[PDB]
């Protein structure tokens, strides 16, 4: 463990260990056994090449796929050239059953298949289960926290910064709502991607299948196989390999989600740096650093490096295939582990956040110049011309503060109805927040 | 023009020139004028701040947007935040020069409540949407059409597959082109489903100004109406000073995956031509090079450099915004120009393609070893065990040819019913193509 080179299987092992069920040699051997068994179960239920075995013999066949133990995986690696060992393992387990039924049909293990028929279905089921069971729910945990923050702090005023400089006020809940909205959108796009598989023999064309059974409609038959036994979409058109385009789509989608989370990580770092948030060191006893957000920032960038690699190399495979796709594909697990490490750090980070009210309100009260616009807007509503230049002229050579802005209102805007004058004099930076509070508390509803 | 640094505006200007309607300073100024005019038209039809002008005054206002000439653009650049304020002055001046008391009153409402990113993001959205729908996607769809025509025309024409570059079970040229059709069809559909979004929410995304100007207006609904009615755009409610750009990233990711498929196509055709299986209609008079596919390959890689840039930098904008996004966005035009240049070269390339039948047929008849599998599958259908090892033992030390494979059939497979034996002796590499012909000609329906 301590001698492991990859931080995935080294220091971050506990944070990402649940991925081993979907992505690892163990997981891969396991799902290949399942595919070979279900292919044989399917050939039996279709009776393409033999008559159906007894109800008990199917049960014994099915059991090879359902009870997969560490010793079963150990026996496959002992035979290992990758999927041929799996083929050998299934045949052996059918031979050691001593049922004449299964000893006859043993020879139909891997019948018609290329090794990529088995692998692509195994990868597809692993990727689909991983995303739906582990990765997307983790992202959805982040959205939930962002929603709760959006509602809880919907009203809490916060000085905006554009180009780093003070601007019209917002609320902390609103700024968190914007991230909810972005991630809500990315998650929807990702779950609309259909995980696809094929099962078309050596070269994609059912060459072998046509000679073996000339009147079988193999397009409909494989469609059935993939839907019934794996709940997968069938991509009919392929070479020796599945095109991988769906993996590219998913990874593009997760990479956009990750870019939003990088934006979030940096903004929170910035709010914490500005002393507007607090978190619930070797030298300074009260120094508290946003390390969860920093650690996530780095791991999201790494995840995305893998994602950019996938969508750039996966689309190219020379002719009816080159093998370089398969070493790359072996890294989907790593890519999603970096995602998972980062997502867990964002969550740890978000759960430590509290507002610093006194600091939020002090800053707003030191930035009265952000009332420049609503004063100009009101002046223009009552037919004032060159409102900006008037404020500019009045403040020339002055350090704009509350007294200056309110003196501007009293003397330069007195032509306004006095009710309107009084409304402007009631305005403060903290109180000029538009529909920020409305928009933050309704983010889920307004999706 | 010959002094231009970018090949976009230099050597490839004729190939990509129709993009300047959508992407150029001229196009940008033009669309900004349109946004400002329509905002003022919308304010008038809602009567938020003034009572409706005469039917002819609206006509005169709308005409500023409809008749945009080079001299109008010249006038804006002469006036040239500093960018959109010139546009704002341009529209005001045109309303002043109308001498209509109606428009002299309402001209002060030009750009009322707007930030410059309200204007720009709508202008960008309308330009991007129109460009994709009118120029870029139809160019991609032209490539699809040609691939479909190639798939049908050559559906039957046998071609030796290569896996790891080595001979494999036969396919057809039409089938190999159909795989590409299917992939591109898919990419185009994904790209057309991306919704082009815009916002119009003032300084900081929260309608701060709007709320003080008209306290009982629901600005969310109002802007939804504005954007749908005047531009037919989706409204992304949640923003800062900037629109988040997430839809741009989706589009570019979508175009990048299409481009990767085309790179794969470009390389495969280069390889088929290299192998003398296709022909194209300074020293070597009969040397003919696949330059169209080569040129496209390079320009697709460049297009993807920009797209990877967009999807990685556009997601980050510090706090309520940093300005780095705006220089980057100025390059969408360039990115789409490199796309268009490459798509036109792929089209030029595909229209020169013809098969070399004699070469296709001779290669297949030099590769009888690819009949290994159908022989083995027929043996195993009739209960043969270790079919592979039997063929391997028979061919040990021999250079496999037609005589060898057919001698294997005659003497080693004679236990099969004689009808099956003669079916095997009827097989040739060119006639072991599976459902390639049927899959190729039916690609439009099946994919």
PDB file of N, CA and C in Angstrom, chain A residues 327-390:
ATOM      1  N   UNK A 327      -5.203   0.323 -23.915  1.00  0.00           N
ATOM      2  CA  UNK A 327      -4.430   0.824 -22.764  1.00  0.00           C
ATOM      3  C   UNK A 327      -5.031   2.099 -22.215  1.00  0.00           C
ATOM      4  N   UNK A 328      -5.576   2.918 -23.105  1.00  0.00           N
ATOM      5  CA  UNK A 328      -6.171   4.177 -22.705  1.00  0.00           C
ATOM      6  C   UNK A 328      -7.446   3.921 -21.900  1.00  0.00           C
ATOM      7  N   UNK A 329      -8.337   3.092 -22.455  1.00  0.00           N
ATOM      8  CA  UNK A 329      -9.590   2.669 -21.803  1.00  0.00           C
ATOM      9  C   UNK A 329      -9.408   2.149 -20.384  1.00  0.00           C
ATOM     10  N   UNK A 330      -8.229   1.598 -20.101  1.00  0.00           N
ATOM     11  CA  UNK A 330      -7.897   0.993 -18.821  1.00  0.00           C
ATOM     12  C   UNK A 330      -7.791   2.069 -17.736  1.00  0.00           C
ATOM     13  N   UNK A 331      -7.771   3.332 -18.154  1.00  0.00           N
ATOM     14  CA  UNK A 331      -7.641   4.457 -17.252  1.00  0.00           C
ATOM     15  C   UNK A 331      -8.928   5.194 -16.905  1.00  0.00           C
ATOM     16  N   UNK A 332     -10.071   4.697 -17.374  1.00  0.00           N
ATOM     17  CA  UNK A 332     -11.366   5.335 -17.036  1.00  0.00           C
ATOM     18  C   UNK A 332     -11.550   5.319 -15.525  1.00  0.00           C
ATOM     19  N   UNK A 333     -11.167   4.209 -14.900  1.00  0.00           N
ATOM     20  CA  UNK A 333     -11.207   4.080 -13.455  1.00  0.00           C
ATOM     21  C   UNK A 333     -10.443   5.182 -12.746  1.00  0.00           C
ATOM     22  N   UNK A 334      -9.178   5.387 -13.128  1.00  0.00           N
ATOM     23  CA  UNK A 334      -8.341   6.451 -12.586  1.00  0.00           C
ATOM     24  C   UNK A 334      -9.008   7.795 -12.770  1.00  0.00           C
ATOM     25  N   UNK A 335      -9.466   8.094 -13.991  1.00  0.00           N
ATOM     26  CA  UNK A 335     -10.115   9.360 -14.256  1.00  0.00           C
ATOM     27  C   UNK A 335     -11.248   9.627 -13.250  1.00  0.00           C
ATOM     28  N   UNK A 336     -12.099   8.626 -13.014  1.00  0.00           N
ATOM     29  CA  UNK A 336     -13.280   8.755 -12.166  1.00  0.00           C
ATOM     30  C   UNK A 336     -12.921   8.740 -10.673  1.00  0.00           C
ATOM     31  N   UNK A 337     -11.777   8.152 -10.333  1.00  0.00           N
ATOM     32  CA  UNK A 337     -11.259   8.214  -8.966  1.00  0.00           C
ATOM     33  C   UNK A 337     -10.813   9.635  -8.617  1.00  0.00           C
ATOM     34  N   UNK A 338     -10.101  10.311  -9.523  1.00  0.00           N
ATOM     35  CA  UNK A 338      -9.744  11.706  -9.328  1.00  0.00           C
ATOM     36  C   UNK A 338     -10.991  12.585  -9.185  1.00  0.00           C
ATOM     37  N   UNK A 339     -12.004  12.350 -10.028  1.00  0.00           N
ATOM     38  CA  UNK A 339     -13.333  12.969  -9.846  1.00  0.00           C
ATOM     39  C   UNK A 339     -13.853  12.746  -8.430  1.00  0.00           C
ATOM     40  N   UNK A 340     -13.899  11.495  -8.015  1.00  0.00           N
ATOM     41  CA  UNK A 340     -14.485  11.135  -6.735  1.00  0.00           C
ATOM     42  C   UNK A 340     -13.732  11.741  -5.541  1.00  0.00           C
ATOM     43  N   UNK A 341     -12.400  11.664  -5.567  1.00  0.00           N
ATOM     44  CA  UNK A 341     -11.559  12.338  -4.574  1.00  0.00           C
ATOM     45  C   UNK A 341     -11.902  13.823  -4.477  1.00  0.00           C
ATOM     46  N   UNK A 342     -11.937  14.503  -5.614  1.00  0.00           N
ATOM     47  CA  UNK A 342     -12.289  15.929  -5.662  1.00  0.00           C
ATOM     48  C   UNK A 342     -13.705  16.205  -5.115  1.00  0.00           C
ATOM     49  N   UNK A 343     -14.700  15.416  -5.547  1.00  0.00           N
ATOM     50  CA  UNK A 343     -16.112  15.635  -5.148  1.00  0.00           C
ATOM     51  C   UNK A 343     -16.300  15.497  -3.654  1.00  0.00           C
ATOM     52  N   UNK A 344     -15.615  14.521  -3.061  1.00  0.00           N
ATOM     53  CA  UNK A 344     -15.622  14.346  -1.612  1.00  0.00           C
ATOM     54  C   UNK A 344     -14.963  15.491  -0.859  1.00  0.00           C
ATOM     55  N   UNK A 345     -13.911  16.087  -1.432  1.00  0.00           N
ATOM     56  CA  UNK A 345     -13.256  17.272  -0.834  1.00  0.00           C
ATOM     57  C   UNK A 345     -14.119  18.531  -0.925  1.00  0.00           C
ATOM     58  N   UNK A 346     -14.765  18.755  -2.067  1.00  0.00           N
ATOM     59  CA  UNK A 346     -15.756  19.843  -2.188  1.00  0.00           C
ATOM     60  C   UNK A 346     -16.848  19.722  -1.094  1.00  0.00           C
ATOM     61  N   UNK A 347     -17.447  18.539  -0.959  1.00  0.00           N
ATOM     62  CA  UNK A 347     -18.410  18.273   0.121  1.00  0.00           C
ATOM     63  C   UNK A 347     -17.863  18.500   1.544  1.00  0.00           C
ATOM     64  N   UNK A 348     -16.705  17.922   1.880  1.00  0.00           N
ATOM     65  CA  UNK A 348     -16.046  18.238   3.156  1.00  0.00           C
ATOM     66  C   UNK A 348     -15.926  19.765   3.308  1.00  0.00           C
ATOM     67  N   UNK A 349     -15.489  20.436   2.249  1.00  0.00           N
ATOM     68  CA  UNK A 349     -15.286  21.876   2.303  1.00  0.00           C
ATOM     69  C   UNK A 349     -16.547  22.682   2.535  1.00  0.00           C
ATOM     70  N   UNK A 350     -17.592  22.369   1.768  1.00  0.00           N
ATOM     71  CA  UNK A 350     -18.881  23.073   1.834  1.00  0.00           C
ATOM     72  C   UNK A 350     -19.567  22.946   3.191  1.00  0.00           C
ATOM     73  N   UNK A 351     -19.396  21.793   3.832  1.00  0.00           N
ATOM     74  CA  UNK A 351     -19.918  21.547   5.181  1.00  0.00           C
ATOM     75  C   UNK A 351     -19.196  22.292   6.324  1.00  0.00           C
ATOM     76  N   UNK A 352     -18.006  22.830   6.046  1.00  0.00           N
ATOM     77  CA  UNK A 352     -17.284  23.661   7.016  1.00  0.00           C
ATOM     78  C   UNK A 352     -17.612  25.162   6.913  1.00  0.00           C
ATOM     79  N   UNK A 353     -18.257  25.562   5.818  1.00  0.00           N
ATOM     80  CA  UNK A 353     -18.500  26.978   5.524  1.00  0.00           C
ATOM     81  C   UNK A 353     -19.473  27.618   6.509  1.00  0.00           C
ATOM     82  N   UNK A 354     -19.109  28.790   7.004  1.00  0.00           N
ATOM     83  CA  UNK A 354     -20.072  29.695   7.613  1.00  0.00           C
ATOM     84  C   UNK A 354     -19.789  31.085   7.086  1.00  0.00           C
ATOM     85  N   UNK A 355     -20.815  31.929   7.084  1.00  0.00           N
ATOM     86  CA  UNK A 355     -20.664  33.354   6.794  1.00  0.00           C
ATOM     87  C   UNK A 355     -19.981  34.097   7.948  1.00  0.00           C
ATOM     88  N   UNK A 356     -19.333  35.206   7.608  1.00  0.00           N
ATOM     89  CA  UNK A 356     -18.779  36.149   8.565  1.00  0.00           C
ATOM     90  C   UNK A 356     -19.588  37.414   8.391  1.00  0.00           C
ATOM     91  N   UNK A 357     -20.686  37.510   9.141  1.00  0.00           N
ATOM     92  CA  UNK A 357     -21.663  38.586   9.005  1.00  0.00           C
ATOM     93  C   UNK A 357     -21.080  39.973   9.161  1.00  0.00           C
ATOM     94  N   UNK A 358     -20.356  40.173  10.255  1.00  0.00           N
ATOM     95  CA  UNK A 358     -19.763  41.467  10.579  1.00  0.00           C
ATOM     96  C   UNK A 358     -18.869  41.922   9.456  1.00  0.00           C
ATOM     97  N   UNK A 359     -18.057  41.013   8.913  1.00  0.00           N
ATOM     98  CA  UNK A 359     -17.166  41.352   7.800  1.00  0.00           C
ATOM     99  C   UNK A 359     -17.923  41.600   6.487  1.00  0.00           C
ATOM    100  N   UNK A 360     -18.955  40.801   6.207  1.00  0.00           N
ATOM    101  CA  UNK A 360     -19.820  41.056   5.050  1.00  0.00           C
ATOM    102  C   UNK A 360     -20.460  42.450   5.105  1.00  0.00           C
ATOM    103  N   UNK A 361     -21.045  42.805   6.249  1.00  0.00           N
ATOM    104  CA  UNK A 361     -21.695  44.116   6.384  1.00  0.00           C
ATOM    105  C   UNK A 361     -20.746  45.310   6.454  1.00  0.00           C
ATOM    106  N   UNK A 362     -19.588  45.152   7.094  1.00  0.00           N
ATOM    107  CA  UNK A 362     -18.562  46.210   7.085  1.00  0.00           C
ATOM    108  C   UNK A 362     -18.117  46.591   5.681  1.00  0.00           C
ATOM    109  N   UNK A 363     -17.809  45.592   4.868  1.00  0.00           N
ATOM    110  CA  UNK A 363     -17.374  45.823   3.502  1.00  0.00           C
ATOM    111  C   UNK A 363     -18.441  46.567   2.686  1.00  0.00           C
ATOM    112  N   UNK A 364     -19.693  46.136   2.794  1.00  0.00           N
ATOM    113  CA  UNK A 364     -20.786  46.814   2.096  1.00  0.00           C
ATOM    114  C   UNK A 364     -20.913  48.286   2.519  1.00  0.00           C
ATOM    115  N   UNK A 365     -20.775  48.537   3.820  1.00  0.00           N
ATOM    116  CA  UNK A 365     -20.861  49.890   4.358  1.00  0.00           C
ATOM    117  C   UNK A 365     -19.638  50.774   4.046  1.00  0.00           C
ATOM    118  N   UNK A 366     -18.564  50.172   3.536  1.00  0.00           N
ATOM    119  CA  UNK A 366     -17.388  50.917   3.061  1.00  0.00           C
ATOM    120  C   UNK A 366     -17.418  51.115   1.534  1.00  0.00           C
ATOM    121  N   UNK A 367     -18.530  50.764   0.894  1.00  0.00           N
ATOM    122  CA  UNK A 367     -18.596  50.797  -0.578  1.00  0.00           C
ATOM    123  C   UNK A 367     -19.868  51.440  -1.135  1.00  0.00           C
ATOM    124  N   UNK A 368     -20.128  52.647  -0.635  1.00  0.00           N
ATOM    125  CA  UNK A 368     -21.296  53.421  -0.972  1.00  0.00           C
ATOM    126  C   UNK A 368     -21.343  53.856  -2.424  1.00  0.00           C
ATOM    127  N   UNK A 369     -20.179  53.927  -3.072  1.00  0.00           N
ATOM    128  CA  UNK A 369     -20.094  54.229  -4.514  1.00  0.00           C
ATOM    129  C   UNK A 369     -20.847  53.248  -5.432  1.00  0.00           C
ATOM    130  N   UNK A 370     -21.123  52.034  -4.960  1.00  0.00           N
ATOM    131  CA  UNK A 370     -21.952  51.083  -5.731  1.00  0.00           C
ATOM    132  C   UNK A 370     -23.438  51.519  -5.865  1.00  0.00           C
ATOM    133  N   UNK A 371     -23.805  52.648  -5.244  1.00  0.00           N
ATOM    134  CA  UNK A 371     -25.143  53.209  -5.381  1.00  0.00           C
ATOM    135  C   UNK A 371     -25.199  54.200  -6.537  1.00  0.00           C
ATOM    136  N   UNK A 372     -24.089  54.299  -7.277  1.00  0.00           N
ATOM    137  CA  UNK A 372     -23.999  55.187  -8.429  1.00  0.00           C
ATOM    138  C   UNK A 372     -25.112  54.901  -9.421  1.00  0.00           C
ATOM    139  N   UNK A 373     -25.290  53.621  -9.750  1.00  0.00           N
ATOM    140  CA  UNK A 373     -26.257  53.209 -10.771  1.00  0.00           C
ATOM    141  C   UNK A 373     -27.740  53.410 -10.413  1.00  0.00           C
ATOM    142  N   UNK A 374     -28.181  52.964  -9.227  1.00  0.00           N
ATOM    143  CA  UNK A 374     -29.607  53.183  -8.957  1.00  0.00           C
ATOM    144  C   UNK A 374     -29.992  54.680  -8.907  1.00  0.00           C
ATOM    145  N   UNK A 375     -29.103  55.538  -8.411  1.00  0.00           N
ATOM    146  CA  UNK A 375     -29.341  56.986  -8.465  1.00  0.00           C
ATOM    147  C   UNK A 375     -29.499  57.473  -9.920  1.00  0.00           C
ATOM    148  N   UNK A 376     -28.575  57.085 -10.800  1.00  0.00           N
ATOM    149  CA  UNK A 376     -28.648  57.430 -12.227  1.00  0.00           C
ATOM    150  C   UNK A 376     -29.896  56.917 -12.923  1.00  0.00           C
ATOM    151  N   UNK A 377     -30.303  55.705 -12.572  1.00  0.00           N
ATOM    152  CA  UNK A 377     -31.489  55.047 -13.128  1.00  0.00           C
ATOM    153  C   UNK A 377     -32.778  55.830 -12.800  1.00  0.00           C
ATOM    154  N   UNK A 378     -32.881  56.251 -11.542  1.00  0.00           N
ATOM    155  CA  UNK A 378     -34.008  57.040 -11.047  1.00  0.00           C
ATOM    156  C   UNK A 378     -34.036  58.439 -11.673  1.00  0.00           C
ATOM    157  N   UNK A 379     -32.867  59.069 -11.818  1.00  0.00           N
ATOM    158  CA  UNK A 379     -32.762  60.370 -12.459  1.00  0.00           C
ATOM    159  C   UNK A 379     -33.261  60.322 -13.894  1.00  0.00           C
ATOM    160  N   UNK A 380     -32.834  59.291 -14.625  1.00  0.00           N
ATOM    161  CA  UNK A 380     -33.186  59.073 -16.032  1.00  0.00           C
ATOM    162  C   UNK A 380     -34.666  58.753 -16.220  1.00  0.00           C
ATOM    163  N   UNK A 381     -35.263  58.135 -15.207  1.00  0.00           N
ATOM    164  CA  UNK A 381     -36.685  57.820 -15.198  1.00  0.00           C
ATOM    165  C   UNK A 381     -37.523  59.105 -15.135  1.00  0.00           C
ATOM    166  N   UNK A 382     -36.976  60.147 -14.503  1.00  0.00           N
ATOM    167  CA  UNK A 382     -37.616  61.462 -14.462  1.00  0.00           C
ATOM    168  C   UNK A 382     -36.901  62.435 -15.403  1.00  0.00           C
ATOM    169  N   UNK A 383     -36.475  61.877 -16.537  1.00  0.00           N
ATOM    170  CA  UNK A 383     -36.008  62.625 -17.708  1.00  0.00           C
ATOM    171  C   UNK A 383     -34.660  63.349 -17.603  1.00  0.00           C
ATOM    172  N   UNK A 384     -33.860  63.006 -16.590  1.00  0.00           N
ATOM    173  CA  UNK A 384     -32.499  63.550 -16.495  1.00  0.00           C
ATOM    174  C   UNK A 384     -31.627  63.058 -17.650  1.00  0.00           C
ATOM    175  N   UNK A 385     -30.737  63.921 -18.119  1.00  0.00           N
ATOM    176  CA  UNK A 385     -29.834  63.606 -19.231  1.00  0.00           C
ATOM    177  C   UNK A 385     -28.401  63.752 -18.737  1.00  0.00           C
ATOM    178  N   UNK A 386     -27.511  62.850 -19.153  1.00  0.00           N
ATOM    179  CA  UNK A 386     -26.102  62.866 -18.706  1.00  0.00           C
ATOM    180  C   UNK A 386     -25.967  62.693 -17.185  1.00  0.00           C
ATOM    181  N   UNK A 387     -26.737  61.752 -16.633  1.00  0.00           N
ATOM    182  CA  UNK A 387     -26.704  61.446 -15.202  1.00  0.00           C
ATOM    183  C   UNK A 387     -25.315  61.013 -14.709  1.00  0.00           C
ATOM    184  N   UNK A 388     -24.600  60.249 -15.531  1.00  0.00           N
ATOM    185  CA  UNK A 388     -23.283  59.721 -15.162  1.00  0.00           C
ATOM    186  C   UNK A 388     -22.256  60.828 -14.984  1.00  0.00           C
ATOM    187  N   UNK A 389     -22.199  61.682 -15.997  1.00  0.00           N
ATOM    188  CA  UNK A 389     -21.297  62.821 -16.067  1.00  0.00           C
ATOM    189  C   UNK A 389     -21.543  63.810 -14.913  1.00  0.00           C
ATOM    190  N   UNK A 390     -22.796  63.918 -14.471  1.00  0.00           N
ATOM    191  CA  UNK A 390     -23.191  64.741 -13.314  1.00  0.00           C
ATOM    192  C   UNK A 390     -22.625  64.202 -12.002  1.00  0.00           C
TER     193      UNK A 390
END
